[PDB]
Design an enzyme around this catalytic site. Sequence first.
Site, PDB file in Angstrom:
ATOM      1  N   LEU A 134     -22.787  41.251 -21.755  1.00  0.00           N
ATOM      2  CA  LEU A 134     -24.225  41.015 -21.703  1.00  0.00           C
ATOM      3  C   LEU A 134     -24.978  42.344 -21.550  1.00  0.00           C
ATOM      4  O   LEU A 134     -24.454  43.305 -20.958  1.00  0.00           O
ATOM      5  CB  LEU A 134     -24.588  39.980 -20.636  1.00  0.00           C
ATOM      6  CG  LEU A 134     -23.980  38.578 -20.772  1.00  0.00           C
ATOM      7  CD1 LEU A 134     -24.588  37.652 -19.744  1.00  0.00           C
ATOM      8  CD2 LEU A 134     -24.172  38.009 -22.169  1.00  0.00           C
ATOM      9  N   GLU A 167     -28.008  33.084 -12.627  1.00  0.00           N
ATOM     10  CA  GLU A 167     -28.164  32.742 -14.031  1.00  0.00           C
ATOM     11  C   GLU A 167     -26.849  32.178 -14.574  1.00  0.00           C
ATOM     12  O   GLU A 167     -26.840  31.158 -15.263  1.00  0.00           O
ATOM     13  CB  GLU A 167     -28.642  33.949 -14.842  1.00  0.00           C
ATOM     14  CG  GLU A 167     -29.503  33.568 -16.043  1.00  0.00           C
ATOM     15  CD  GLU A 167     -28.711  32.933 -17.178  1.00  0.00           C
ATOM     16  OE1 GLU A 167     -29.204  31.932 -17.764  1.00  0.00           O
ATOM     17  OE2 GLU A 167     -27.606  33.417 -17.490  1.00  0.00           O
TER      18      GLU A 167
HETATM   19  N1  NDP Z   1     -26.541  36.257 -23.728  1.00  0.00           N
HETATM   20  C1  NDP Z   1     -26.013  35.075 -24.073  1.00  0.00           C
HETATM   21  O1  NDP Z   1     -26.456  33.992 -23.740  1.00  0.00           O
HETATM   22  C2  NDP Z   1     -24.790  35.119 -24.967  1.00  0.00           C
HETATM   23  C3  NDP Z   1     -24.274  36.348 -25.302  1.00  0.00           C
HETATM   24  N2  NDP Z   1     -23.160  36.426 -26.126  1.00  0.00           N
HETATM   25  C4  NDP Z   1     -22.696  37.773 -26.433  1.00  0.00           C
HETATM   26  O2  NDP Z   1     -23.146  37.923 -27.789  1.00  0.00           O
HETATM   27  C5  NDP Z   1     -22.124  38.509 -28.544  1.00  0.00           C
HETATM   28  C6  NDP Z   1     -22.458  37.803 -29.836  1.00  0.00           C
HETATM   29  O3  NDP Z   1     -21.295  37.373 -30.464  1.00  0.00           O
HETATM   30  P1  NDP Z   1     -21.251  37.405 -32.040  1.00  0.00           P
HETATM   31  O4  NDP Z   1     -20.971  38.798 -32.452  1.00  0.00           O
HETATM   32  O5  NDP Z   1     -22.434  36.728 -32.584  1.00  0.00           O
HETATM   33  O6  NDP Z   1     -19.879  36.544 -32.312  1.00  0.00           O
HETATM   34  P2  NDP Z   1     -19.360  34.982 -32.383  1.00  0.00           P
HETATM   35  O7  NDP Z   1     -18.973  34.529 -31.049  1.00  0.00           O
HETATM   36  O8  NDP Z   1     -20.266  34.125 -33.168  1.00  0.00           O
HETATM   37  O9  NDP Z   1     -18.048  35.283 -33.145  1.00  0.00           O
HETATM   38  C7  NDP Z   1     -18.107  35.753 -34.489  1.00  0.00           C
HETATM   39  C8  NDP Z   1     -16.817  35.346 -35.091  1.00  0.00           C
HETATM   40  O10 NDP Z   1     -16.717  33.883 -34.684  1.00  0.00           O
HETATM   41  C9  NDP Z   1     -16.034  33.219 -35.725  1.00  0.00           C
HETATM   42  N3  NDP Z   1     -17.146  32.341 -36.271  1.00  0.00           N
HETATM   43  C10 NDP Z   1     -18.454  32.424 -35.979  1.00  0.00           C
HETATM   44  N4  NDP Z   1     -19.112  31.437 -36.595  1.00  0.00           N
HETATM   45  C11 NDP Z   1     -18.230  30.690 -37.245  1.00  0.00           C
HETATM   46  C12 NDP Z   1     -18.322  29.552 -38.043  1.00  0.00           C
HETATM   47  N5  NDP Z   1     -19.489  28.945 -38.292  1.00  0.00           N
HETATM   48  N6  NDP Z   1     -17.189  29.053 -38.561  1.00  0.00           N
HETATM   49  C13 NDP Z   1     -16.012  29.628 -38.321  1.00  0.00           C
HETATM   50  N7  NDP Z   1     -15.891  30.711 -37.586  1.00  0.00           N
HETATM   51  C14 NDP Z   1     -16.981  31.263 -37.028  1.00  0.00           C
HETATM   52  C15 NDP Z   1     -15.424  34.549 -36.144  1.00  0.00           C
HETATM   53  O11 NDP Z   1     -14.176  34.420 -36.702  1.00  0.00           O
HETATM   54  P3  NDP Z   1     -13.356  34.758 -37.910  1.00  0.00           P
HETATM   55  O12 NDP Z   1     -13.709  36.211 -38.478  1.00  0.00           O
HETATM   56  O13 NDP Z   1     -11.983  34.834 -37.101  1.00  0.00           O
HETATM   57  O14 NDP Z   1     -13.421  33.688 -38.922  1.00  0.00           O
HETATM   58  C16 NDP Z   1     -16.566  35.389 -36.602  1.00  0.00           C
HETATM   59  O15 NDP Z   1     -16.155  36.714 -36.954  1.00  0.00           O
HETATM   60  C17 NDP Z   1     -20.813  38.086 -27.868  1.00  0.00           C
HETATM   61  O16 NDP Z   1     -19.939  39.195 -27.895  1.00  0.00           O
HETATM   62  C18 NDP Z   1     -21.183  37.796 -26.411  1.00  0.00           C
HETATM   63  O17 NDP Z   1     -20.797  38.841 -25.503  1.00  0.00           O
HETATM   64  C19 NDP Z   1     -22.547  35.263 -26.643  1.00  0.00           C
HETATM   65  C20 NDP Z   1     -23.081  34.026 -26.297  1.00  0.00           C
HETATM   66  C21 NDP Z   1     -24.201  33.945 -25.465  1.00  0.00           C
HETATM   67  C1  DH1 Z   2     -20.653  32.655 -24.060  1.00  0.00           C
HETATM   68  O1  DH1 Z   2     -21.659  32.153 -23.175  1.00  0.00           O
HETATM   69  C2  DH1 Z   2     -21.274  32.373 -21.897  1.00  0.00           C
HETATM   70  C3  DH1 Z   2     -20.045  31.897 -21.428  1.00  0.00           C
HETATM   71  C4  DH1 Z   2     -19.674  32.142 -20.115  1.00  0.00           C
HETATM   72  C5  DH1 Z   2     -20.525  32.858 -19.285  1.00  0.00           C
HETATM   73  O2  DH1 Z   2     -20.165  33.099 -18.001  1.00  0.00           O
HETATM   74  C6  DH1 Z   2     -20.827  32.200 -17.136  1.00  0.00           C
HETATM   75  C7  DH1 Z   2     -19.947  32.009 -15.914  1.00  0.00           C
HETATM   76  C8  DH1 Z   2     -20.258  30.655 -15.312  1.00  0.00           C
HETATM   77  C9  DH1 Z   2     -18.982  29.998 -14.816  1.00  0.00           C
HETATM   78  C10 DH1 Z   2     -18.642  28.712 -15.575  1.00  0.00           C
HETATM   79  O3  DH1 Z   2     -19.433  28.309 -16.465  1.00  0.00           O
HETATM   80  O4  DH1 Z   2     -17.578  28.161 -15.237  1.00  0.00           O
HETATM   81  C11 DH1 Z   2     -21.750  33.321 -19.759  1.00  0.00           C
HETATM   82  C12 DH1 Z   2     -22.130  33.079 -21.067  1.00  0.00           C
HETATM   83  C13 DH1 Z   2     -23.467  33.634 -21.541  1.00  0.00           C
HETATM   84  C14 DH1 Z   2     -24.686  32.761 -21.221  1.00  0.00           C
HETATM   85  C15 DH1 Z   2     -25.348  33.081 -20.042  1.00  0.00           C
HETATM   86  N1  DH1 Z   2     -26.433  32.427 -19.686  1.00  0.00           N
HETATM   87  C16 DH1 Z   2     -26.923  31.439 -20.458  1.00  0.00           C
HETATM   88  N2  DH1 Z   2     -28.020  30.813 -20.059  1.00  0.00           N
HETATM   89  N3  DH1 Z   2     -26.329  31.107 -21.606  1.00  0.00           N
HETATM   90  C17 DH1 Z   2     -25.219  31.730 -22.021  1.00  0.00           C
HETATM   91  N4  DH1 Z   2     -24.680  31.323 -23.167  1.00  0.00           N
END
Ligand code: NDP
Ligand code: DH1
Length: 186
Positions: free
Chosen positions: A22, A30
């Site tokens: 993050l 959060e």
């Molecule tokens: N702040 C937040 O709330 C969140 C933050 N994050 C952060 O954001 C970063 C964003 O991740 P991001 O780079 O977008 O990567 P994703 O998690 O979307 O992963 C991308 C990879 O996921 C597979 N993939 C994604 N979409 C599909 C689909 N529709 N069908 C099949 N396979 C799929 C991969 O596999 P393949 O090449 O093997 O096919 C593709 O290369 C993460 O590293 C995480 O740390 C993530 C979630 C929430």
């Molecule tokens: C990939 O999205 C997340 C997955 C896990 C994460 O850690 C949270 C720990 C809580 C413990 C548990 O759930 O058992 C954080 C994220 C990112 C994320 C953070 N905040 C919000 N609102 N959405 C997210 N997707």
Amino acid sequence: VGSLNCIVAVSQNMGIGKNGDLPWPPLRNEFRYFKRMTTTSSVEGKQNLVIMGKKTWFSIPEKNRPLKGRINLVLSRELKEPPQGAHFLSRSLDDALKLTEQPELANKVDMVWIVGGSSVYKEAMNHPGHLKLFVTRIMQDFESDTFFPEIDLEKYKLLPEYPGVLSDVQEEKGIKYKFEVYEKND
Ligand SMILES: NC(=O)C1=CN([C@@H]2O[C@H](COP(=O)(O)OP(=O)(O)OC[C@H]3O[C@@H](n4cnc5c(N)ncnc54)[C@@H](OP(=O)(O)O)[C@@H]3O)[C@@H](O)[C@H]2O)C=CC1
Ligand SMILES: COc1ccc(OCCCCC(=O)O)cc1Cc1cnc(N)nc1N
């Protein structure tokens, strides 16, 4: 199967990640909110399903994987089987949602939560149907290398409040943030 939802925390510059982490320092409460929202199931005898891309899966600390009390499904076309600790693997989002309707899951899954990353959010957000976005607004800019897709406010209505979601400003580690819920139906 119940509702379809996305959940994300996002900075003012639309950042959601930097190098698989993050963009901001850990915000304990959060994370607790994320845990509570994605785990809490409205229906007795069911669990919620979390859907995430491959990179998102591996961004979760191993100690927190799989997300406990939830069914964990990973999206990938490269993987041949679910990663260590995961429960299901699908090639596409449409495939994953189809799977929930199969006899092996239709009776087991309540809410579906899409938890990242960018491309998965984008496809869900632009696919016709009933969808909610649970968005934590981190109210500062943070250096990021992946970003939340644009929220089309002509489609996504910001709800005035929502049960179980605090409406006021939160602050941890000197960082102010707030919880929002958006809903579309098209
Ligand atoms: N702040 C937040 O709330 C969140 C933050 N994050 C952060 O954001 C970063 C964003 O991740 P991001 O780079 O977008 O990567 P994703 O998690 O979307 O992963 C991308 C990879 O996921 C597979 N993939 C994604 N979409 C599909 C689909 N529709 N069908 C099949 N396979 C799929 C991969 O596999 P393949 O090449 O093997 O096919 C593709 O290369 C993460 O590293 C995480 O740390 C993530 C979630 C929430
Ligand atoms: C990939 O999205 C997340 C997955 C896990 C994460 O850690 C949270 C720990 C809580 C413990 C548990 O759930 O058992 C954080 C994220 C990112 C994320 C953070 N905040 C919000 N609102 N959405 C997210 N997707």
